[PDB]
C-alpha cells in the first residue's frame, strides 16, 4: 500500500496553475503509485445536490468523476490528492483499482517526477 509513503512524497502548496496544487517532495519513479484520491463513492445523480449543499455552506467542493454514474466525493473525507490540478500535458493519470473488493482511485506517475514539480493529470 502507500498511505504511509504518500505523506513523505507529496505536499500541498500554492500553484501557478490555479489555487493550491500537489507538489512532489522527493523524486517519484515512473510507474510508482503516488497517492490515492480519498473519498466516498457516491452516485453521480447526487453530485448536483451535494454541490448545492456545499456551496451554500461555503465548503469547497472536491469531486472526482469515476464514470457516468459514480464520482468520488472528497469534500469531507478526502486527502491531499484533491488538490491535484489539471494539465493537457500531464505527468500523472488516474486508474480505478480493486483491492479485496473495493474501488479505489489511485494516481500513478507517467514519467519520473522531480522534487518541486507540480503533479497534474488530464481531467476529460
Amino acid at each position: 500500500a502507500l498511505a504511509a509513503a504518500s505523506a513523505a512524497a507529496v505536499g500541498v502548496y500554492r500553484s501557478p496553475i490555479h489555487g493550491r496544487g500537489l507538489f512532489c517532495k522527493r523524486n517519484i519513479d515512473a510507474g510508482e503509485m503516488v497517492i490515492e484520491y480519498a473519498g466516498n463513492v457516491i452516485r453521480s445523480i447526487q453530485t448536483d445536490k451535494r454541490e448545492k449543499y456545499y456551496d451554500s455552506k461555503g465548503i469547497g467542493c472536491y469531486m472526482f468523476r469515476i464514470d457516468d454514474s459514480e464520482v468520488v466525493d472528497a469534500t469531507m473525507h478526502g486527502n491531499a490528492a484533491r488538490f491535484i490540478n489539471h494539465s493537457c500535458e500531464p505527468n500523472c493519470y488516474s486508474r480505478v483499482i480493486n483491492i479485496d473488493g473495493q474501488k479505489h482511485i489511485v494516481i500513478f506517475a507517467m514519467r519520473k517526477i522531480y522534487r518541486g514539480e507540480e503533479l497534474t493529470y488530464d481531467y476529460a
Binding site: 454541490e51 472536491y62 469531486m63 472526482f64 468523476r65 484533491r82 476529460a124
Partner: peptide, 4 residues
C-alpha cells in the same frame, strides 16, 4: 474531473 473536479466539480462534477
Amino acid at each position: 474531473v473536479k466539480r462534477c
